[PDB]
């Protein structure tokens, strides 16, 4: 069930309440979710950790 | 067979009327 989900979902997978409040009012969605605590995103710094 | 057929018809009506419709069926 995780494998048949698109990669954008796997990006935002932890941040559902921020995601759906930022969709149900027209705001900017999160970019990290549960995947923020990966070591590579730890190595990145700035807006390129969103990248 | 009176007490069987009459009671069977009464039980069948008392069941089948409580899940059915007449003017709501076409709706």
């Amino acid at each position: 069930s995780l494998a048949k989900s698109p990669a954008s979902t796997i990006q935002i997978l932890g941040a559902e309440k921020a995601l759906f409040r930022a969709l149900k009012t027209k705001h900017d969605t999160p970019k990290y979710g549960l995947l923020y605590h990966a070591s590579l995103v730890g190595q990145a710094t700035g807006k390129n950790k969103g990248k | 067979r009176k007490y069987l057929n009459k009671l069977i018809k009464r039980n069948s009506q008392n069941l089948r009327s409580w899940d059915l419709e007449e003017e709501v069926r076409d709706e």
Binding site: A3, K4, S5, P6, A7, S8 | -
Partner: protein, 121 residues
């Protein structure tokens, strides 16, 4: 690759990639596997084209698993390079979903190709 069920022959793959080219000109396709699965989730895909050419084919063969839940047709063509040429980008494209429309100019071509697809299921 053995585990790429229905694979198209040359004539069917030529007309599949022709309708992919005119859908790309009409901006009616979503190119890429994640965009194809998004259209599968939202139910706005007519049919899915995949490429039996990716070196892990298991990065593909999961959208069959939710194609057979929404009974949307899916097909394999042998070349990801040629699918990318047909979709009209500079990269190889692994999967592509032709999206739904009812005022579309190429609706008859989409319907003809999807019937030829669901004959071989």
């Amino acid at each position: 690759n053995p585990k790429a069920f229905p694979l198209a022959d040359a004539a069917l793959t030529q007309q599949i990639l022709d309708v992919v080219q005119q859908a790309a000109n009409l901006r009616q396709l979503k190119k890429g596997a994640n965009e194809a699965t998004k259209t599968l989730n939202r139910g706005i895909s007519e049919f899915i084209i995949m490429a039996a050419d990716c070196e892990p084919i298991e990065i593909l063969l999961h959208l069959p698993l939710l194609c057979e839940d929404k009974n949307v047709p899916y097909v394999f063509v042998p070349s990801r390079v040629a699918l990318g040429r047909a979709c009209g980008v500079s990269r190889p494209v692994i999967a592509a979903s032709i999206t739904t429309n009812d005022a579309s100019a190429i609706k008859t071509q989409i319907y003809a190709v999807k019937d030829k697809i669901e004959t071989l299921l």
